[PDB]
């Protein structure tokens, strides 16, 4: 194992794409502004966004 | 000294009022949206907001 690769926390565009990808199973309403959510969260990882989506569905 | 009083980090409205109070000396342009700034910052204290305003003036 030679190549060391660092994987940081996601930025705004990646959080947009993560929130889009974690919601293709559920039907959401079209007035939900996901870009506003991704702008508001800074130190979140992918598991945190998945936790938010799961609590909403619950 | 009897009464213990805890003073937390400021919330959104307090950050709005801090950013307003730290700019009465300088002339700012009227298209600056301070409420957006106060919505974006969460863990900032008063010294951090004063630092931002000072770097802008510089």
């Amino acid at each position: 194992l030679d190549q060391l690769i660092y994987i940081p926390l996601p930025d705004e565009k990646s959080r947009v794409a993560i929130l889009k990808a974690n919601l293709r199973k559920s039907p959401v309403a079209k007035d939900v502004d996901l870009e506003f959510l991704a702008k508001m969260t800074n130190g979140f990882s992918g598991a945190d966004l998945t936790e938010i989506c799961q609590r909403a569905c619950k | 000294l009897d009464q213990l009083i805890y003073i937390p980090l400021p919330d959104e409205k307090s950050r709005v009022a801090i950013l307003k109070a730290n700019l009465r000396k300088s002339p700012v342009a009227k298209d600056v949206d301070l409420e957006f700034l106060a919505k974006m910052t969460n863990g900032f204290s008063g010294a951090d907001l004063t630092e931002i305003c000072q770097r802008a003036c510089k």
């Binding site: 940081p8 800074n42 | 298209d31 949206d33 957006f36």
Partner: peptide, 23 residues
């Protein structure tokens, strides 16, 4: 010295910060 210089870094974020261009 590089490590102490990196302890004085800004918050890891806030690049490409923009106000909403609202007419």
């Amino acid at each position: 010295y590089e490590m102490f210089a990196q302890t004085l870094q800004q918050s890891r974020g806030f690049g490409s910060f923009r106000f909403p261009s609202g007419n």
